[PDB]
């Protein structure tokens, strides 16, 4: 998910469905 995202500027709207694409949790 996004909660386990260690990136400051990953998602624009804090979206996960679009973030997970690059982030492997």
Chain residues binding Zn ion by CB under 5 A are 5, 7, 10, 19, 23
- Shortest Cβ 17–Zn ion spacing (Å): 11
Round to whole Å and give the CA distance between 6 and 25.
Answer: 9
Round to whole Å and give the CA distance between 17 and 25.
Answer: 12
- Shortest Cβ 24–Zn ion spacing (Å): 9
Beta carbon nearer to Zn ion, 5 or 17: 5
- Shortest Cβ 19–Zn ion spacing (Å): 4
């Amino acid at each position: 998910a996004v909660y386990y995202c260690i990136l400051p500027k990953c998602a624009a709207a804090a979206n996960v469905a679009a973030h997970t694409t690059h982030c492997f949790k």
